[PDB]
RNA sequence: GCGGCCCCCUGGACGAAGACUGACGCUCAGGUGCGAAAGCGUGGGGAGCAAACAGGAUUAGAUACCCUGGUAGUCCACGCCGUAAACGAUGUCGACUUGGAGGUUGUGCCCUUGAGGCGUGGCUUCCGGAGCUAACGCGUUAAGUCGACCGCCUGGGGAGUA
RNA sequence: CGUAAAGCGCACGCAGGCGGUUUGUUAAGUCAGAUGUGAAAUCCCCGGGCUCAACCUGGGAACUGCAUCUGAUACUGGCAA
RNA sequence: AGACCAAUGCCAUGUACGUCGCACUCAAUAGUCAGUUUUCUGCA
């Protein structure tokens, strides 16, 4: 709701002509996003995104670059929602089938880990198995309790996370992206011209989104 | 109607704060994506849901089902009383699936579709009719159903819903 | 009401280290009989696995066609790779009279009585791809009147 | 195709502002001109290089590759020839259609507060979007989207031969 | 017609083909109608006779053309500005 | 970096790729009519 405070746009380099409607674009070789265009765009994204959030849907924040972590873990986990913060595996939506059995192995190995037989029979293989829980835990972290493929997708950079956008367009999932002036509005259904790599901007930004996901009529 | 926003004068002030002349005025044709239908549910999504649901039905894996009596199954963590309720007919199925005459492959797909539909429509109880066969759908289908994570419990259907030729199935739904 | 039919099976080869290895490719088209046409390619090591992968890919990837009463609407030309294809609505111009591998897609497409004549290449894998492209960019009088106002 | 420097005679291109003519334009079969190199004719020149040629090697042989010599030729004047993988293997002229990084040559504006900032032309290089393409790739210098006129193609060989 | 066959080695240019934009006139091309002709048979259509059919046959359509007259003037051409 | 390395009878190659099934039986409701006369029957 609050006016974007401190980002005003970025990316002098590799700017994309399809971002030409969103650029004010003056200072010191770098491009300034027209935030007077961003505010209606971002309010629309909060509108439809709250609309699917009230229908009891799953949202899947996507935060692979740094420092979108742990800001996407903090914002998704502040809601009762899901996230990807480390490397987004190629095909966790379009073959979720195979990713379902990897999530199943993460559940079986944490149940085996903190409760069952973890000290049993070996030290070396037990260390091997625990670092399998680090690898499967940081890759399949947020998505491990989803149990479906989600009803929307909220990516924090459109060019850095083009794979996830390409799959959610492949599957008919609404993509909500904060694009920058280098990115491309591929199949992003609700584009938001913003700043992808400022931590102030993405914490303000995810703060608003996580605010409207759990917003409660009460 | 225009959404509430900072005043135009305020926007101009933001423009004033912008260091330098600080104005970008490139004009280009603008294309806006059509708004998604409220109903949604595109056939492709449905097909995808079906495929996802049927993915669990393996011919190689055989869950241990009770060999004594009418066919029944309860998923670990679900109250055993649910199977009893199915037997007594406490649950009235809202969806009916007829598998009789289908190949195994077709049947798996239809079962997947049924489960997807139950989830989508928040239907908790469905009836699956497989007919009577030896080493056929009548035997293979319960095994496939058990392997599905959304299947909570099933029991031989009461006579009113097909008896020994049908199953009542309880499906886990997000509400 | 699925109405599947196979057009072409071939034996392709690979030429590994020790001799050659022979694989089989199917090419099928399914369709309900009222628009809704799909094709699938599918390739496997034996013929029934190939046709099954082809049907399974063809049941998805299925396209709507805006039919007329039982036929096309206006004459349409679809091209794909080297394969140029003409079609003409033939307002009850009886019987589907199309080339091979075009008769099948037009048959399960639900159209009954058009006139065709494929030109150029007439490889079956590209003469469909030039019938769907074709039937895809054929639009109806309620779509043209939707576009241009009335 | 043109590579030291200088003079003389001379062709074109591009840019800036303004003036003038007023469709005078585009393409072009036959026709005419120019057209690398080798070659030919007449007369010069001839250092290097070098077909031919000779010798030495190498080799089974070596009319070759390698070595040592070496004539025409290459150089100049005038005339002929009239061809090349004469190739961006892409005819000429015009119009339209997202971009990025350079090079080169003009010109305008702004504190020129420097080897700057903002534009606007001409030619050119690399990469790529849509589109096209059998593919490879082309991609505002198109092989995209069109128009005008010309040239040429129609299976391989025989044969670009008689 | 880059690489499959196919862009003259490159230009200049005659005859030829094509030609920005506005107004007026003409009406040659173009279009509309009319008239004369386009033989009959044959093809096509609707009927009729051979027991049916082939066949024969009545009427029409057609013969996509040409010529002349009457108009229309948007485009192309001619002429004037 | 940069010696020297020539040639390799005659044929046809293939069979060969076209797909399925199930069933079943247990019960009501023949016939039965009548039954002397009365009456104390713990108490606060």
Curated annotation (Swiss-Prot), chain A:
It comes from the Bacteria. SUPFAM superfamilies: Ribosomal protein S2. The modification N6-succinyllysine is found at residue 107. One of its GO terms (biological process) is cytoplasmic translation. The keyword tRNA processing does not apply. Keywords: Ribonucleoprotein, Ribosomal protein. One of its GO terms (cellular component) is cytosolic small ribosomal subunit. One of its GO terms (molecular function) is zinc ion binding. InterPro entries: Ribosomal_uS2, Ribosomal_uS2_bac/mit/plastid, Ribosomal_uS2_CS, Ribosomal_uS2_flav_dom_sf. PANTHER family: 30S RIBOSOMAL PROTEIN S2 PROKARYOTIC AND ORGANELLAR, SMALL RIBOSOMAL SUBUNIT PROTEIN US2M. Part of the 30S ribosomal subunit, contacts bS1. Some nascent polypeptide chains are able to cross-link to this protein in situ. In collided ribosomes contacts ribosome rescue factor SmrB. Belongs to the universal ribosomal protein uS2 family. Required for ribosomal protein bS1 (rpsA) to bind to the 30S subunit. This is Small ribosomal subunit protein uS2. It comes from Escherichia coli (strain K12).
């Amino acid at each position: 709701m609050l006016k974007a405070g401190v980002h005003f746009g970025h990316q002098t380099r590799y700017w994309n002509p399809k971002m030409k409607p969103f650029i004010f674009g003056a200072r010191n070789k770098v491009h300034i996003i027209n935030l007077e265009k961003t505010v209606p765009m971002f309010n629309e994204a909060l509108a439809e995104l709250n609309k699917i959030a009230s229908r009891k849907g799953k949202i899947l924040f996507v935060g692979t670059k740094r420092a979108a972590s742990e800001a996407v873990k903090d914002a998704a986990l502040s809601c009762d929602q899901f996230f990807v913060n480390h490397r987004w595996l190629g095909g966790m939506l379009t073959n979720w089938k195979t990713v379902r059995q990897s999530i199943k192995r993460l559940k079986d190995l944490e149940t085996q880990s903190q409760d069952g037989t973890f000290d049993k029979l070996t030290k070396k293989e037990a260390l091997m198995r625990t670092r399998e829980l680090e690898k499967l835990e940081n890759s399949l972290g947020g998505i491990k309790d989803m149990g479906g493929l989600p009803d929307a997708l909220f990516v924090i950079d459109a060019d850095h996370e083009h794979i996830a956008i390409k799959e959610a367009n492949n599957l008919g999932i609404p993509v909500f992206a904060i694009v920058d002036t280098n990115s491309d509005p591929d199949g992003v259904d609700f584009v938001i011209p913003g700043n992808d790599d400022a931590i102030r901007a993405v914490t303000l930004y995810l703060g608003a989104v996580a605010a409207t996901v759990r917003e409660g009529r009460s | 109607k225009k959404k509430t926003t900072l005043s135009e004068e305020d926007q101009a002030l933001f423009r004033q704060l912008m260091a330098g002349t600080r104005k970008i005025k490139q004009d280009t044709i603008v294309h806006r994506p059509q708004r998604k239908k409220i109903s949604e549910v595109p056939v492709k999504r449905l097909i995808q849901e079906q495929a996802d649901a049927s993915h669990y039905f393996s011919d190689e894996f055989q869950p241990l089902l009770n060999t004594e009596g009418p066919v029944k199954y309860v998923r670990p963590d679900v109250s055993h009383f649910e199977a009893k309720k199915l037997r007594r007919g406490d649950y009235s199925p809202e969806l009916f699936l007829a598998l009789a005459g289908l190949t195994q492959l077709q049947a798996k797909q239809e079962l997947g579709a049924l489960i997807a539909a139950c989830r989508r429509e928040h239907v908790f109880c469905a009836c699956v009719m497989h007919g009577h066969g030896k080493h056929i759908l009548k035997q293979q289908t319960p095994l496939w159903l058990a392997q599905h994570p959304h299947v909570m419990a099933f029991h031989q259907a009461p006579k009113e819903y097909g008896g020994d030729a049908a199953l009542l199935v309880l499906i886990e739904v997000e509400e | 009401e699925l109405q599947e039919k196979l057009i072409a099976v071939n034996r392709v080869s690979k030429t590994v280290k020790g001799g050659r290895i022979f694989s089989f490719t199917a090419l099928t088209v399914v369709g309900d009989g009222n628009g809704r046409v799909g094709f699938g390619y599918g390739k496997a090591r034996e013929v029934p696995a190939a046709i099954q992968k082809a049907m399974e890919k063809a049941r998805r990837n299925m396209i709507n066609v805006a039919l007329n009463n039982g036929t096309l609407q206006h004459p349409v030309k679809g091209v794909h790779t080297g394969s140029r294809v003409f079609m003409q609505p033939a307002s009850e111009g009886t019987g589907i009279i199309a080339g091979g591998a075009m008769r099948a897609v037009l048959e399960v497409a639900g159209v009954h009585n058009v006139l065709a004549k494929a030109y150029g290449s007439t490889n079956p894998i590209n003469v469909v791809r030039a019938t769907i492209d074709g039937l895809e960019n054929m639009n109806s009088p309620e779509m043209v009147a939707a576009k241009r106002g009335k």
